[PDB]
Amino acid sequence: AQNPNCNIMIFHPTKEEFNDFDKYIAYMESQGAHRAGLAKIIPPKEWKARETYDNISEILIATPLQQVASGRAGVFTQYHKKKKAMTVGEYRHLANSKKYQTPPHQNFEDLERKYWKNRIYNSPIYGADISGSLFDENTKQWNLGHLGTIQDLLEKECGVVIEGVNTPYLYFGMWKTTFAWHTEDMDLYSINYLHLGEPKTWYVVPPEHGQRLERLARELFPGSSRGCGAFLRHKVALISPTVLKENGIPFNRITQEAGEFMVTFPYGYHAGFNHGFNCAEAINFATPRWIDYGKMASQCSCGEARVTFSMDAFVRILQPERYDLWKRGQD
Numbered sequence: 615a616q617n618p619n620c621n622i623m624i625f626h627p628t629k630e631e632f633n634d635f636d637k638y639i640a641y642m643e644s645q646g647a648h649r650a651g652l653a654k655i656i657p658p659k660e661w662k663a664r665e666t667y668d669n670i671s672e673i674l675i676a677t678p679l680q681q682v683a684s685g686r687a688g689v690f691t692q693y694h695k696k697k698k699a700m701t702v703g704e705y706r707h708l709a710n711s712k713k714y715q716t717p718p719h720q721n722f723e724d725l726e727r728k729y730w731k732n733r734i735y736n737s738p739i740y741g742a743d744i745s746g747s748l749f750d751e752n753t754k755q756w757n758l759g760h761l762g763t764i765q766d767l768l769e770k771e772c773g774v775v776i777e778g779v780n781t782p783y784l785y786f787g788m789w790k791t792t793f794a795w796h797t798e799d800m801d802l803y804s805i806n807y808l809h810l811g812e813p814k815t816w817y818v819v820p821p822e823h824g825q826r827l828e829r830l831a832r833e834l835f836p837g838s839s840r841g842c843g844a845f846l847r848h849k850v851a852l853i854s855p856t857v858l859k860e861n862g863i864p865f866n867r868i869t870q871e872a873g874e875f876m877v878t879f880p881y882g883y884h885a886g887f888n889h890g891f892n893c894a895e896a897i898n899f900a901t902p903r904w905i906d907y908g909k910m911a912s913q914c915s916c917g918e919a920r921v922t923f924s925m926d927a928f929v930r931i932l933q934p935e936r937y938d939l940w941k942r943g944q945d
């Protein structure tokens with residue numbers, strides 16, 4: 615079995631190997647990359663996402679989210695308070711202000727320590743989940759707006775044509791902006807490109823051990839667990855590496871820098887934080903290997919998780935027994 619310790623693997627494809635996206639994902643899996651839940655892909659030196667980022671300031675962040683924490687430093691939830699619209703140029707200025715900027719630090723490890731010690735005492739503002747793309751249309755390789763769609767994958771594998779679309783999302787971050795522990799909708803893959811700015815630190819639980827994380831979460835968030843049998847779908851709970859280690863949960867960590875891709879694999883729980891002002895682009899995707907995960911994915915029906923239009927068909931076709939209950943939670 616390849617990668618039996620479930621370590622995060624880092625790949626350096628050549629420009630030739632960067633042509634065929636599906637083929638390269640399958641290669642990484644042949645080497646055991648999915649066992650970690652997360653892989654890093656450093657593009658060939660010849661590649662670029664676009665020519666420059668000099669002209670992005672007028673993008674609008676219609677609903678910036680202030681991420682307010684409750685709990686203790688290593689075990690907390692966050693809620694998202696909506697803020698007034700602002701442009702990317704306005705948000706960058708805010709991220710660089712004395713109130714929100716990255717503190718002085720020695721290295722990524724020192725900054726990580728500072729994040730876990732102090733995150734709860736601040737409320738950073740995240741420009742998350744903005745439909746759009748920063749890839750140039752002429753970028754042919756690993757262009758996250760030009761991937762094969764999940765609807766087409768399901769049709770190819772299963773023969774059923776379904777409605778829905780699959781487009782990318784932009785994320786503008788600042789110091790301490792946080793992504794809570796989650797798997798993707800329908801336990802899909804994700805791919806995330808860090809276009810510019812400061813790093814993003816990731817934590818991940820191997821898919822084979824995801825249920826260990828879920829059991830800890832139920833213990834640590836006991837009211838939330840009574841409310842919903844899949845409350846991590848709400849994407850609000852944080853647990854620190856120290857708490858994970860104290861509770862014997864297998865995990866790994868890595869820091870993504872600008873110009874790098876990360877892939878999350880089906881049922882790979884992940885969480886993390888941004889070091890400072892940055893912009894990432896991410897999208898979900900599927901492969902043949904996903905189908906069995908999609909069929910088994912948990913679902914939130916309590917009403918909290920509310921998701922896209924396109925998840926309807928995935929539930930309806932892959933999980934017909936669950937469909938009626940899940941759709942009630944959507945309405």
Ligand SMILES: O=C(O)CNC(=O)C(=O)O
Binds near residue numbers: 792804805894
């Ligand atoms: O970058 C973020 O805030 C969160 N991204 C992801 O969870 C992802 O790409 O799957």
Ligand SMILES: [Mg+2]
Binds near residue numbers: 669670671672673
């Ligand atoms: Mg602009």
Ligand code: NI
Binds near residue numbers: 796797804878884
């Ligand atoms: Ni994710």
Ligand SMILES: [Zn+2]
Binds near residue numbers: 847
């Ligand atoms: Zn729920």
